[PDB]
Amino acid sequence: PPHGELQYLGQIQHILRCGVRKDDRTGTGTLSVFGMQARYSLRDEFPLLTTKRVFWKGVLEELLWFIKGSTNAKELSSKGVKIWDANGSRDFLDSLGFSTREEGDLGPVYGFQWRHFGAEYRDMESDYSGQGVDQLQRVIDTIKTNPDDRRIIMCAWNPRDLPLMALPPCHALCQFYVVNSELSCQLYQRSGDMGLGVPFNIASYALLTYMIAHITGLKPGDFIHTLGDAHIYLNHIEPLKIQLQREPRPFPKLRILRKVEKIDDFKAEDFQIEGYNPHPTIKMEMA
Amino acid sequence: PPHGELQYLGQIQHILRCGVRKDDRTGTGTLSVFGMQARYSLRDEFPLLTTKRVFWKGVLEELLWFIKGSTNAKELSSKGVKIWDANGSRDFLDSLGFSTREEGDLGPVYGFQWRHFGAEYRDMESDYSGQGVDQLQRVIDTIKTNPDDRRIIMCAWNPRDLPLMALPPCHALCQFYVVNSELSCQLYQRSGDMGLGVPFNIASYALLTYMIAHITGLKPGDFIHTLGDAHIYLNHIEPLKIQLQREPRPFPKLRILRKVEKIDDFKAEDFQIEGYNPHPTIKMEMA
Ligand SMILES: O=c1ccn([C@H]2C[C@H](O)[C@@H](COP(=O)(O)O)O2)c(=O)[nH]1
Ligand SMILES: O=c1ccn([C@H]2C[C@H](O)[C@@H](COP(=O)(O)O)O2)c(=O)[nH]1
Ligand SMILES: [Cl-]
């Protein structure tokens, strides 16, 4: 029975061989395929890639920051995870014509869309309690009451809010699915940087699934990752060919250390990755 | 190259062989698989299924009806297509608690979200011009000016609006992609009745791509159909095994009969399906 990591490595291989050359907004150049889908089993394994070290601290801390609805890069910055920092900087905000906005204000990105979809965004300090739709809690209650439901969706693509956003979300929607007591999740990702983004993104949605599984009493099933524009940046080709030579190692397991009742209650300390000794990190220049 | 239709038929097969029983509200039951993807080439052919007849005129009228932003079932019904009629009727509306709604008023469904995303829904009679995001035109404008864009999305899944819709959308979002003068489109369909609904859905989005390609000077590229809950109703199993007997006849072609430059300008008479040779319609009862 093949290693789950092979779905991912297979996709890189496919894009390297069949991707078509396609310029991008950043100017870097890509090899590009439109429309891909892979399936990672969450059953007694957590698919944290092993052919390079993935930023597990970043994934967990960033997901908790989404859960709490934060739209303040500094709030994540402070937990030791700098991934959003450039996007909240003075210069960049200015780049986009957001001169009035205070630094760190990312606008109505994921955390606001997850907890407050449709509320009038003001700034990153505002109290949004009980405004907009709480999609994350709705997904959880739907699972608890009607697992057969075919509309368990959370959606961060808000055409109305895109003008106000630092970055338009790559992870546009996700759907949950339950049969035989197993919770699955399919993410629609409109845009995937295969090198730097995608491994992080898989870990991030798998983690969401385990969290949701845990508070609804279900076992984690499958994470189905669907891609729009799946791309390898031209300058990721060499780092990736090195990656492609390494041997997958067993995926870690993910242990949740205490029974947790509300998704809001999860703390970073609740979670232990166990058995993860990946091949070394591989830097890939950000585009 | 294998017939495109085989993608669909092989999905039916997979669900028959591999799907798991899952209940729905009707008490029909389904076999179900979560997460599937098929690719239909649009180059010089049009995937209107041939192993049963597809309701092409329903497809074309319905798509033109969405493009106008209509949410009134009666406007479609006057074209000879009755697919939305039940959902707009006095008894149905009452069943949803829209006791005071004019009959035909579907609430903010596809047409409204496509043309007026995020406007406050009034009724099916209202003038909406100027309000909401005209996602369909924005997608068009973006294809002409910035074909490389990885953000060309139209979203019908509006959590704010769901409580007011006759039905929640099955097609939650679609993404467009351009490379080498070819326009592709991926649909994310959260829920697919494989027998009754999917061959229709496929024709629908293939048609839309053909329309947009036309007005932007592009060749049709690929249609990628992604599915969440891909299901066969138990009372379709037998009809489907009849269908699987049949061997696909070359897909017809779509000719568009005149130069049209605004998507609103398309009329049904503008389109000819040429060389469609389906086996007979197979009746499949609505769940
Ligand atoms: O979680 C994320 C965020 C971004 N990206 C990549 C995809 C693109 O390369 C780029 C976003 O830029 P656009 O697709 O918007 O051009 O970052 C990811 O892979 N994952
Ligand atoms: O364009 C459409 C609309 C509906 N359905 C099917 C999918 C489900 O069987 C049902 C919708 O019911 P829910 O998924 O909302 O329960 O209709 C389609 O296949 N295509
Ligand atoms: Cl990483």
Q: How many angstroms separate the CA atoms of A71 and A238, rounded?
A: 35
Establish if B148 touches chain A: CB-CB under 8 angstroms: yes
Distance from Cα A153 to the centre of ligand 2, integer Å: 15
- Nearest alpha-carbon partner for A116 in A94, A100, A92, A132: A132
DSSP string, B260-273: --SGGG--GGGEEE
Residue nearest to atom 20 of ligand 2 (CA): B197
Catalytic-residue membership of A170: yes
SS3 B12: helix
Q: Do B34 and A226 touch (CB under 8 A)?
A: no
Count Cβ atoms below 10 Å from residue B99 Cβ, excluding itself. 9
Q: How many angstroms separate the CA atoms of A185 and B27, rounded?
A: 25
Of residues A133, A135, A175, nearest to B228 (C-beta): A175
User: How far, in Å, are B8, B12, B152, B239, B240 from residue B51 at the CA level?
Assistant: 10, 13, 33, 12, 10
Neighbours of ion ligand 3 (CB under 5 A): A 54-55, 200
Distance from Cα A285 to the centre of ligand 1, integer Å: 13
The reply, when asked if residue A287 is annotated as ligand binding, is yes
- Please name each of the domains of chain B with its CATH number: 1-287 (3.30.572.10)
Technique of determination: X-ray
**Beta-sheet strands, E only, within B51-181:** 153-155, 171-179
Q: Starting at the edge strand that comes first in sequence, how are the strands of the sheet with A20-22 ordered?
A: A20-22, A30-41, A219-233, A182-193, A171-179, A153-155
Count Cβ atoms below 10 Å from residue B80 Cβ, excluding itself. 10
The active-site residue out of A18, A155, A170, A174 is A170
Q: Which two tokens stand for residue A257?
A: 């250390």
Residue with tokens 């509309």: A151
Give CA torsion, residues A99, A101, A107, A112, to 10 deg. -170
Q: How many angstroms separate the CA atoms of A138 and B111, rounded?
A: 25
Distance from Cα B160 to the centre of ligand 2, integer Å: 20
Establish if B226 touches chain A: CB-CB under 8 angstroms: yes
Annotated binding site of B: 25, 150-151, 170-171, 190-193, 201, 231-233, 287
The reply, when asked if residue A233 is annotated as ligand binding, is yes
Strand B182-193 and strand B219-233: pairing? parallel
Eight-state DSSP code of residue A263: G
Establish if B167 touches chain A: CB-CB under 8 angstroms: no
Q: Candidates A49, A59, A170: which one to mutate for ligand 1, based on the most atoms within 8 Å of Cβ?
A: A170
The answer for residues whose C-beta is within 8 angstroms of residue B49's C-beta and 6 or more apart is B5, B8, B199, B202, B203, B248, B278
How many Å lie between the alpha carbon of B63 and the closest alpha carbon of chain A?
21
Count Cβ atoms below 10 Å from residue B115 Cβ, excluding itself. 24
Give CA torsion, residues B258, B263, B268, B270, to 10 deg. 0
Give CA torsion, residues A129, A86, B141, B207, to 10 deg. -70
Q: Do A22 and B179 touch (CB under 8 A)?
A: yes
User: How far, in Å, are A38, A184, A250, B61, B222 from residue B185 at the CA level?
Assistant: 19, 25, 36, 20, 6
Q: Do B177 and A228 touch (CB under 8 A)?
A: yes
How many Å lie between the alpha carbon of A233 and the closest alpha carbon of chain B?
14
Q: Which two tokens stand for residue B56?
A: 């092409």
Q: How many angstroms separate the CA atoms of B92 and B84, rounded?
A: 11
Q: How many angstroms separate the CA atoms of A33 and A206, rounded?
A: 23
Most B CBs within 10 Å, among A26, A30, A137, A150, to test the B interface: A150
Q: Which ligand is nearest to the CA of A166?
A: 1
CB of residue A283 inside a 6 A radius of ligand 1:
no
CB of residue B150 inside a 6 A radius of ligand 1:
yes
CB of residue B170 inside a 6 A radius of ligand 2:
yes
Of residues A157, A173, A190, nearest to B150 (C-beta): A190
**Residue B201: CA count within 13 A, CB half-sphere:** 27
Residue with tokens 């979560």: B34
Q: How many angstroms separate the CA atoms of B222 and B136, rounded?
A: 19
Q: Which two tokens stand for residue B111?
A: 């047409």
Q: Answer yes or no: are the C-beta atoms of B221 and B177 closer than 8 Å.
A: yes
Q: What distance lies between CA A27 and its chain's CA centroid? A: 24
Q: How many angstroms separate the CA atoms of A272 and B8, rounded?
A: 42
Q: How many angstroms separate the CA atoms of B45 and A227, rounded?
A: 25
Q: Which ligand is nearest to the CA of A58?
A: 3
Q: Answer yes or no: are the C-beta atoms of B248 and B265 closer than 8 Å.
A: no
**Residue A112: CA count within 13 A, CB half-sphere:** 28
Query: Which atom of ligand 2 is least distant from the CA of B171?
Result: 1
Q: Which residues on adjacent β-strands are paired with residue A155? A: A173
CB of residue A197 inside a 6 A radius of ligand 1:
yes
Output the CA torsion sign for A247, A225, B223, B137: negative
Q: Starting at the edge strand that comes first in sequence, how are the strands of the sheet with B182-193 ordered?
A: B20-22, B30-41, B219-233, B182-193, B171-179, B153-155
Q: Answer yes or no: are the C-beta atoms of A118 and B159 closer than 8 Å.
A: yes
Strand B20-22 and strand B30-41: pairing? antiparallel
- Burial class, B281, CB count within 10 angstroms (exposed 0-12 / middle 13-18 / buried 19+): exposed
CB of residue A202 inside a 6 A radius of ligand 1:
no
Q: How many angstroms separate the CA atoms of A83 and B284, rounded?
A: 52
CB of residue A36 inside a 6 A radius of ligand 1:
no
Establish if B145 touches chain A: CB-CB under 8 angstroms: no
The answer for residues whose C-beta is within 8 angstroms of residue A230's C-beta and 6 or more apart is A11, A15, A32, A33, A34, A35, A36, A192, A194, A198
CB of residue B252 inside a 6 A radius of ligand 2:
no
